[PDB]
Amino acid sequence: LRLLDHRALVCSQPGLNCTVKNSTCLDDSWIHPRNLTPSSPKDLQIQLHFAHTQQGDLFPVAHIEWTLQTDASILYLEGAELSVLQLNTNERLCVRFEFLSKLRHHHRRWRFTFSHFVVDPDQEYEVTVHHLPKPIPDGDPNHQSKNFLVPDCEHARMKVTTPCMSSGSLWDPDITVETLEAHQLRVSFTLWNESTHYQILLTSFPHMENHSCFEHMHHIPAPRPEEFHQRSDVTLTLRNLKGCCRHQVQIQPFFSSCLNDCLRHSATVSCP
Amino acid sequence: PRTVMVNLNIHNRNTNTNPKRSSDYYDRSTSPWNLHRNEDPERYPSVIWEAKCRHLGCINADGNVDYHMNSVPIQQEILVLRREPPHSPNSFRLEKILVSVGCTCVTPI
Amino acid sequence: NFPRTVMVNLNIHSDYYDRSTSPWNLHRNEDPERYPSVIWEAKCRHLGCINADGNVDYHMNSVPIQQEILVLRREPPHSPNSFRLEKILVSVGCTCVTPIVHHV
Ligand SMILES: *[C@@H]1O[C@H](CO[C@@H]2O[C@@H](C)[C@@H](O)[C@@H](O)[C@@H]2O)[C@@H](O[C@@H]2O[C@H](CO)[C@@H](O[C@H]3O[C@H](CO)[C@@H](O)[C@H](O[C@H]4O[C@H](CO)[C@@H](O)[C@H](O)[C@@H]4O)[C@@H]3O)[C@H](O)[C@H]2NC(C)=O)[C@H](O)[C@H]1NC(C)=O
Ligand SMILES: *[C@@H]1O[C@H](CO[C@@H]2O[C@@H](C)[C@@H](O)[C@@H](O)[C@@H]2O)[C@@H](O[C@@H]2O[C@H](CO)[C@@H](O)[C@H](O)[C@H]2NC(C)=O)[C@H](O)[C@H]1NC(C)=O
Ligand SMILES: *[C@@H]1O[C@H](CO[C@@H]2O[C@@H](C)[C@@H](O)[C@@H](O)[C@@H]2O)[C@@H](O)[C@H](O)[C@H]1NC(C)=O
Hints:
heterotrimer; A: Immunoglobulin-like; Immunoglobulin-like; four-stranded antiparallel sheet; 2 helices; 44% strand; elongated; B: Cystine Knot Cytokines, subunit B; three-stranded antiparallel sheet; two-stranded antiparallel sheet; 0% helix; binds a molecule of 5 linked components (NAG-NAG-MAN-MAN-FUC); binds a molecule of 3 linked components (NAG-NAG-FUC); binds a molecule of 2 linked components (NAG-FUC); inflammatory response (chain C)
């Protein structure tokens, strides 16, 4: 996990002075509990936002927003710990809001936001805001968690994002499987702007039967920077079998961003 | 040693994330699984997401479950810091815990 | 900060990698300055998964399962009593997944 920039982060607002310090997700209030703990946050909401780095690339960011509860515990609220947990790896990332001033009234409801947590496509996270000090042992919770589910690169806004593009979300191979003279198939496609290898999987089937009568894997070595966006057609010979006519051909890219797990592209040839 | 000195200023060694990676596999796996939140306010880390296999068998090509194969969990023995009472010192304990991190499809013997 | 180092009671107290359709190899990571001292890193055997015949299935993807874990590192070095807590990313095993295919 990461923040999109290491820029001077601000958590201050009129009526409140605070700096966003970073934290080890192991808070000092958990090591050393205090008797008077603040109450829980309210109305935690996480939305999908998109942002640009000081350089230029666009990233999908998590927009965390919460409000404070109306009780007097506000006086004892020292700050908040914002935490992102990826579920697949059990990776955790924290940032802490440190209230330099004391919140006394509730005249106008206090609302907070944090939009620096970079999030990845087709991923599920557990974002949580933990009011500080954290509770005493066996005390009432004082935090709010929500799961965030980021869409895949097929999402309208998502495919134009840096991680998506780098895994070829905008790559259009104009796959053309051509049936040729004497048991031969010519398969053409236009390759992407990355020096990583490719593969061709040809699988032949009978008409209306999901059993492979012939299978072949063909290698395309990593291309030169000049060879980028240019076409690479390969002619492969089929098995001799009157019946083994349905051809399914697919291209596998090996972009650094995804390696073996890149999105493949299939094309099928018919029979009579 | 029975009792040790631990500096909880967690040093993060997980920084080499330079080439791009990761996706959610629990649904795409041939040994698919479900996620279960394991929370304990008294231990660091507080919440741990574990996996529980969906089936005894594995999902075939047609998508139906093949019982000639086996969805098995990938377990991992993990360190956890547990905060004590207060009463009965020490203040913290360091414990080993078994966790299911995902599932794999294996050939039975 | 000021840093809070604490008193911790040390209360401490085998297959599949070969049998999986997505098999993996385990690599020994030794560090005498660390606890656990020896930890095993999985690295997937193939790019594809394996079919019944034992050959590599090119239509499936052998993919790693990783985890962020806690370890103790001796601070100062060689100390018998003092350590510092560290986070580290580790590969635990491999799973077999169906690839994302777009048709035309
Ligand atoms: C890898 O390729 C992608 C896509 O490649 C493009 O499309 C394919 C089909 C081929 O036709 C390629 O030749 C194309 O490059 C690259 O992403 C695109 O990059 C270009 C150039 O950086 C972007 O084009 C235009 O972007 C903005 C849009 O507002 C324009 O303002 C730009 O014009 C200015 O800059 C030009 C170059 O510096 C300059 O010549 C002009 O006079 C003008 O000042 C620019 O023309 C395009 O928008 C990008 N695509 C998307 C969807 O973002 C990618 O950069 C390549 N990556 C690598 C590592 O090679
Ligand atoms: C932990 O924080 C430091 C400081 O960065 C910023 O300032 C803090 C007060 C807080 O608001 C942070 O969230 C901010 O990001 C990070 O150090 C920066 O590192 C970059 C390079 O990685 C460097 O260019 C900056 O100049 C550094 N800033 C300072 C003031 O030292 C540090 O990387 C953060 N750790 C992680 C892993 O996010
Ligand atoms: C938040 O609090 C900050 C604390 O002030 C500090 O002490 C004074 C004497 C100055 O030397 C100042 O530079 C120090 O940071 C102040 O910046 C200020 O009161 C508040 N900041 C904002 C942006 O409102």
